[PDB]
CSV table of N, CA and C and ligand atoms in Angstrom, one decimal:
chain,number,residue,atom,x,y,z
A,43,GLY,N,11.9,6.2,-73.4
A,43,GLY,CA,13.1,6.0,-72.1
A,43,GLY,C,13.6,4.5,-72.9
A,44,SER,N,15.0,4.7,-73.0
A,44,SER,CA,15.7,3.6,-73.4
A,44,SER,C,16.9,3.2,-72.4
A,45,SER,N,17.0,3.8,-71.4
A,45,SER,CA,17.6,3.9,-70.6
A,45,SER,C,17.2,2.4,-69.6
A,46,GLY,N,18.1,1.5,-69.4
A,46,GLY,CA,18.2,0.2,-68.7
A,46,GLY,C,17.5,0.3,-67.3
A,47,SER,N,18.6,0.3,-66.4
A,47,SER,CA,18.1,0.6,-64.7
A,47,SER,C,17.7,2.0,-64.9
A,48,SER,N,16.5,2.3,-63.7
A,48,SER,CA,16.3,3.8,-63.3
A,48,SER,C,15.0,3.4,-62.7
A,49,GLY,N,14.5,4.7,-62.1
A,49,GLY,CA,13.4,4.5,-61.1
A,49,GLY,C,12.5,4.3,-61.5
A,50,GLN,N,11.5,3.5,-60.7
A,50,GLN,CA,10.4,3.0,-61.1
A,50,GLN,C,9.2,2.6,-60.1
A,51,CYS,N,8.0,3.7,-60.5
A,51,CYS,CA,7.1,3.7,-59.3
A,51,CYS,C,6.6,2.2,-58.9
A,52,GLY,N,6.6,2.1,-57.5
A,52,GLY,CA,6.2,0.7,-57.2
A,52,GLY,C,4.9,0.4,-57.5
A,53,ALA,N,3.8,1.5,-57.4
A,53,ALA,CA,2.8,0.9,-57.9
A,53,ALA,C,2.4,0.2,-59.4
A,54,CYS,N,3.0,0.8,-60.4
A,54,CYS,CA,3.0,0.2,-61.7
A,54,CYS,C,4.6,0.4,-62.3
A,55,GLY,N,5.3,1.4,-61.9
A,55,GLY,CA,6.5,1.5,-62.3
A,55,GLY,C,7.2,2.1,-63.5
A,56,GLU,N,6.3,3.3,-63.9
A,56,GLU,CA,6.3,4.2,-64.9
A,56,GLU,C,8.0,4.6,-65.2
A,57,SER,N,8.2,5.9,-66.0
A,57,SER,CA,9.5,6.3,-66.2
A,57,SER,C,9.6,7.6,-65.4
A,58,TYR,N,10.6,8.0,-65.1
A,58,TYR,CA,11.2,9.0,-64.3
A,58,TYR,C,10.8,10.2,-64.9
A,59,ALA,N,9.3,10.7,-64.9
A,59,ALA,CA,9.1,11.9,-66.1
A,59,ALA,C,8.8,13.3,-64.9
A,60,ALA,N,9.2,14.3,-65.5
A,60,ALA,CA,8.9,15.5,-64.5
A,60,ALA,C,7.8,16.5,-64.7
A,61,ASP,N,6.8,15.4,-65.3
A,61,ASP,CA,5.4,16.0,-65.4
A,61,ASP,C,4.6,15.8,-64.6
A,62,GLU,N,4.1,14.3,-64.3
A,62,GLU,CA,3.1,13.7,-63.0
A,62,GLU,C,3.5,14.2,-61.8
A,63,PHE,N,2.5,13.8,-60.7
A,63,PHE,CA,2.5,14.0,-59.3
A,63,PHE,C,2.9,13.1,-58.5
A,64,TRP,N,4.4,13.2,-57.9
A,64,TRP,CA,4.4,12.1,-57.2
A,64,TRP,C,4.2,12.4,-55.7
A,65,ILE,N,4.1,11.5,-54.8
A,65,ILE,CA,4.0,11.6,-53.7
A,65,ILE,C,5.4,11.3,-52.6
A,66,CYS,N,5.6,11.9,-51.6
A,66,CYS,CA,6.6,11.8,-50.8
A,66,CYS,C,6.2,11.0,-49.5
A,67,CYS,N,7.0,9.7,-49.1
A,67,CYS,CA,6.7,9.1,-48.1
A,67,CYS,C,7.6,9.4,-47.0
A,68,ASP,N,7.2,9.2,-46.1
A,68,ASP,CA,7.9,9.4,-44.8
A,68,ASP,C,8.6,7.8,-44.0
A,69,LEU,N,8.2,7.0,-43.7
A,69,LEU,CA,8.8,5.5,-43.8
A,69,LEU,C,9.7,5.1,-44.6
A,70,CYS,N,9.4,4.9,-45.8
A,70,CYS,CA,10.3,4.2,-46.9
A,70,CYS,C,10.8,5.1,-47.5
A,71,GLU,N,10.1,6.3,-47.7
A,71,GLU,CA,10.2,7.6,-48.4
A,71,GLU,C,10.7,7.2,-49.7
A,72,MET,N,9.8,6.5,-50.7
A,72,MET,CA,10.2,6.1,-52.1
A,72,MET,C,9.1,6.8,-52.8
A,73,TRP,N,9.4,6.5,-54.1
A,73,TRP,CA,8.8,7.5,-55.0
A,73,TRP,C,7.7,6.9,-55.9
A,74,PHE,N,6.3,7.6,-55.8
A,74,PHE,CA,5.0,6.9,-56.4
A,74,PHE,C,4.9,8.3,-56.9
A,75,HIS,N,3.5,7.7,-57.5
A,75,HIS,CA,2.4,8.6,-58.0
A,75,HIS,C,1.0,9.0,-57.2
A,76,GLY,N,0.7,10.2,-57.2
A,76,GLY,CA,-0.6,10.7,-56.3
A,76,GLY,C,-1.6,9.6,-56.7
A,77,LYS,N,-2.0,9.8,-57.7
A,77,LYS,CA,-2.8,8.7,-58.2
A,77,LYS,C,-2.9,7.1,-58.3
A,78,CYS,N,-1.7,6.8,-58.0
A,78,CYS,CA,-1.2,5.7,-57.7
A,78,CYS,C,-1.2,5.5,-56.0
A,79,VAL,N,-1.2,6.3,-55.2
A,79,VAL,CA,-1.5,6.3,-54.0
A,79,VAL,C,-2.4,6.9,-53.3
A,80,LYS,N,-3.5,6.4,-54.3
A,80,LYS,CA,-5.0,7.0,-54.0
A,80,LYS,C,-5.0,8.5,-53.4
A,81,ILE,N,-4.1,9.6,-54.5
A,81,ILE,CA,-4.4,10.6,-53.7
A,81,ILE,C,-4.0,11.5,-54.9
A,82,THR,N,-5.2,12.9,-54.5
A,82,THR,CA,-5.5,13.7,-55.7
A,82,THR,C,-4.1,14.6,-55.6
A,83,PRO,N,-3.7,15.1,-56.9
A,83,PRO,CA,-2.7,16.1,-57.1
A,83,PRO,C,-2.9,17.8,-56.8
A,84,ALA,N,-4.2,18.1,-56.3
A,84,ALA,CA,-4.7,18.8,-55.7
A,84,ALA,C,-4.4,18.9,-53.9
A,85,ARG,N,-5.2,18.0,-53.5
A,85,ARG,CA,-5.1,17.5,-52.2
A,85,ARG,C,-3.6,17.3,-51.5
A,86,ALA,N,-2.8,16.6,-52.4
A,86,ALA,CA,-1.2,16.8,-51.9
A,86,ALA,C,-0.9,18.4,-51.1
A,87,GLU,N,-1.6,19.3,-51.6
A,87,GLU,CA,-1.3,20.6,-51.0
A,87,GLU,C,-1.6,20.5,-49.2
A,88,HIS,N,-2.4,20.0,-49.1
A,88,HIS,CA,-2.9,19.9,-47.2
A,88,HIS,C,-2.4,18.6,-47.0
A,89,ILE,N,-1.6,17.8,-47.7
A,89,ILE,CA,-0.9,16.5,-47.1
A,89,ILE,C,0.5,16.8,-47.0
A,90,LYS,N,0.8,16.3,-46.0
A,90,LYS,CA,2.3,16.7,-45.7
A,90,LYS,C,2.9,15.3,-45.2
A,91,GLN,N,3.8,14.8,-45.8
A,91,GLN,CA,4.5,13.3,-45.4
A,91,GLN,C,3.5,12.3,-45.6
A,92,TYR,N,2.3,11.9,-46.6
A,92,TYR,CA,1.6,10.9,-46.3
A,92,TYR,C,1.8,9.4,-46.3
A,93,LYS,N,1.4,8.5,-45.7
A,93,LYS,CA,1.9,7.4,-45.5
A,93,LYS,C,1.4,6.3,-46.5
A,94,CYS,N,2.7,6.3,-47.7
A,94,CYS,CA,2.2,5.4,-48.6
A,94,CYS,C,1.7,4.2,-48.7
A,95,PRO,N,0.7,3.8,-50.3
A,95,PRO,CA,0.2,2.1,-49.6
A,95,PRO,C,1.3,1.1,-49.2
A,96,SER,N,2.3,1.3,-49.8
A,96,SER,CA,3.6,0.4,-49.4
A,96,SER,C,3.8,-0.1,-48.2
A,97,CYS,N,3.8,0.9,-47.4
A,97,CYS,CA,4.1,0.9,-45.8
A,97,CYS,C,2.7,0.4,-45.0
A,98,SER,N,1.8,1.6,-45.6
A,98,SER,CA,0.6,1.8,-44.5
A,98,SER,C,0.2,0.0,-44.9
A,99,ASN,N,0.5,-0.3,-45.5
A,99,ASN,CA,0.0,-2.3,-45.7
A,99,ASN,C,0.3,-2.9,-44.5
A,100,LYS,N,2.2,-2.6,-44.2
A,100,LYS,CA,2.4,-3.4,-43.3
A,100,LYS,C,1.9,-3.3,-41.9
A,101,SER,N,1.7,-4.5,-40.9
A,101,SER,CA,1.0,-4.8,-39.9
A,101,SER,C,-0.2,-4.6,-40.5
A,102,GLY,N,-1.0,-5.2,-41.3
A,102,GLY,CA,-2.2,-4.9,-41.6
A,102,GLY,C,-3.2,-6.0,-41.2
A,103,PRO,N,-4.4,-5.6,-41.0
A,103,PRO,CA,-5.3,-6.9,-40.5
A,103,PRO,C,-5.4,-7.9,-41.1
A,104,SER,N,-5.7,-7.7,-43.2
A,104,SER,CA,-5.8,-8.7,-44.1
A,104,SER,C,-4.7,-9.0,-44.6
A,105,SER,N,-3.6,-8.4,-44.3
A,105,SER,CA,-2.1,-9.1,-44.3
A,105,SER,C,-1.0,-8.5,-43.7
A,106,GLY,N,-0.4,-9.1,-43.0
A,106,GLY,CA,0.8,-8.6,-42.0
A,106,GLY,C,2.0,-8.4,-43.0
B,289,ZN,ZN1,2.6,4.2,-60.6
B,290,ZN,ZN1,6.8,3.9,-47.9
């Protein structure tokens, strides 16, 4: 990773690698990692357009 500006996972902000398992959001449709979004690479199969933790948080009882 030498490129300055580039995609970064909101959870941690790793480099755009075509290896790890990324998740797909519907609200913001951002880029995240299964494990980062509290999701397994195997379960994703049964998951379709999961609500990333970045959005789900919005309008929360602990934090609005
Ligand atoms: Zn991450
Ligand atoms: Zn989202």
